[PDB]
Write a protein that binds this ligand. Structure first.
Ligand SMILES: [Mg+2]
Ligand SMILES: [Mg+2]
Ligand SMILES: [Mg+2]
Ligand SMILES: [Mg+2]
Ligand SMILES: [Mg+2]
Ligand SMILES: [Mg+2]
Ligand code: NA
Ligand code: NA
Lengths: 323, 325
């Protein structure tokens, strides 16, 4: 970083900020699980994850769930953060669409419950375990809903590798569409009812009002991460997959104006969420209300986590003005 | 190909072979719709499609559905066949994973219903129309089920492009997995209840017995297509995405022995279907029985169509021995 100090715009959110009472114990347990997995090969990356307190994100985004549910979700978050850093955005696989695409089938077969992972397949061994643990506390329909979100997330990583390979910044329209699936947020939304020990009916899950609120929550989390992860992403492939970079490139903005435009889109998405929620509230069933409250806790908890996590704050210059 | 006449092995199954009474009328209507769409730019491809009688595949795979259901499904089949030939396998774009991957977002945005297609985007305009027509006769959960199968099918085309790019024949284990989604069969199974005017409940649809029968049927349709489409596929990228090529390459088989091994895998999958169907019979509700009869009609109808279609038969050498009934 060179140039005058950047102002990080606020990310206003009226949703309740809560945290699971089991945060400390489960964060430590889940980190131990990750450290034992060999999903991360470097002691530096493992320690970076320990300092990042991934279980604090789990606890803030799922504040109501029992301890066993929090531990399962926290393990899933650790899998995602590790996969993101070690595989998806790694130099080996992340710059070749063909290579990443051809590497997925064995992992997809593990996800389907069709294939035993090899002893050397750290991500496969962990994914098999998580599939079995989710299956113990979820209906076939809930498991397939989760599995579907994971497959789309995996396929979306090929699109990222494609952009890296051709050295292009994706266009705003392409980026905002694919950003809903490149971040695996839907895989976490898929575990809200499972974690809470309830089951949304197909008609509730797929209701246009519920899908709209899910999509807006997913936009907010994607764009909020883009704003706060911008500095650390600058060190890796020019922060290519980041709404700040995408808007700065395709609307020819200064970095400071791109940051403000991302905050404007956040404020617009919050307003859209509140408008649709008012309509949903007229019919919403008990499970639907719990799920939507789940989305609100996720959006707000994510912001609280990201403003304080060693994963993001360290890369911002000392003179950065935080909101 | 081989310097010795090939025999194509039979693909038997104990499923009823039926045809929708509206076959002739709907095939012609759906072909007219395809012609008007401009998804195909070459007169030669359009005429090849007319001769292929794609509506007879729709009619054989969906023999029970009312005329409006058959027309919607036939239009969808025409979309898939056109997309397969003109976009997925027809262009140099299909030889670079990064190019195909970057082409998909506009189409995904149309599928999600959040983008008006460009006036010149033939595939986009037709997909938007089909999404709306399916939405008129399907619950939101049924529409999302179909949408999910289409997205996986589209993503599966990048995997094919990846194999073309590095010029490798995929391994049997990778190929048999990805073949379930490269051929869009699940997108057609997704319209069985919709077409029939009924709705499988979530825990019926997602029941392990129903998923297993759907997966075995999907395997059968993929492998049966691979057997009969082998000859025409030699004319485009050395039949790379074909179980015959995959087994011949990776199991060091003659072409003749590879054809026989595909037929053996067909028979094994039919036997597995009958084994699992016996378990499903013990609990199956009427909607589940109609859906499973749907899978049976699809497998049998697809074979009946493929043995006779101008799409496949013409590429086989004159001395090829075709199977008995
Ligand atoms: Mg990433
Ligand atoms: Mg990342
Ligand atoms: Mg980020
Ligand atoms: Mg194809
Ligand atoms: Mg083809
Ligand atoms: Mg074929
Ligand atoms: Na939005
Ligand atoms: Na584009």
């Amino acid at each position: 970083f060179t140039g005058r100090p950047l102002h990080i715009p606020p990310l206003p959110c009226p949703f309740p900020s809560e945290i699971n009472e089991h945060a400390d114990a489960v964060d430590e347990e889940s980190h131990t699980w990750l450290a034992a997995s060999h999903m991360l090969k470097g002691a530096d990356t493992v320690e970076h994850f320990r300092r990042s307190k991934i279980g604090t994100l789990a606890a803030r985004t799922n504040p109501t769930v029992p301890r066993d549910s929090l531990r399962l979700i926290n393990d899933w978050y650790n899998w995602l953060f590790a996969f993101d850093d070690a595989f998806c955005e790694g130099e080996l696989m992340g710059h070749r669409a063909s290579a990443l695409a051809r590497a997925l089938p064995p992992l997809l077969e593990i996800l389907d419950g069709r294939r035993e992972p090899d002893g050397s397949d750290a991500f496969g061994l962990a994914l098999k375990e998580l599939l079995h643990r989710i299956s113990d506390v979820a209906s076939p329909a809930q498991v397939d809903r989760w599995r579907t979100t994971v497959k789309e997330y995996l396929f979306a990583q090929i699109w990222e590798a494609a952009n890296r390979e051709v050295d292009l910044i994706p266009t705003p329209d392409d980026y905002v569409l694919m950003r809903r699936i490149t971040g695996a947020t839907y895989t976490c939304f898929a575990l809200i009812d499972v974690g809470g020990g309830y089951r949304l009916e197909a008609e509730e899950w797929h209701h246009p009002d519920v899908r709209t609120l899910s999509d807006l929550a997913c936009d907010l989390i994607g764009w909020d991460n883009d704003l706060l992860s911008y500095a650390k992403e600058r060190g890796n492939d020019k922060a290519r997959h980041n709404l700040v970079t995408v808007l700065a490139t395709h609307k020819s903005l200064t970095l400071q104006d791109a940051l403000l435009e991302v905050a404007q889109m956040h404020n617009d998405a919050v307003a859209a969420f509140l408008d649709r929620r008012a309509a949903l509230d007229r019919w919403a069933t008990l499970p639907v209300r719990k799920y939507v409250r789940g989305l609100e806790h996720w959006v707000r908890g994510h912001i609280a986590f990201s403003l304080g996590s060693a994963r993001y704050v360290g890369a911002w210059p000392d003179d950065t003005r935080w909101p």
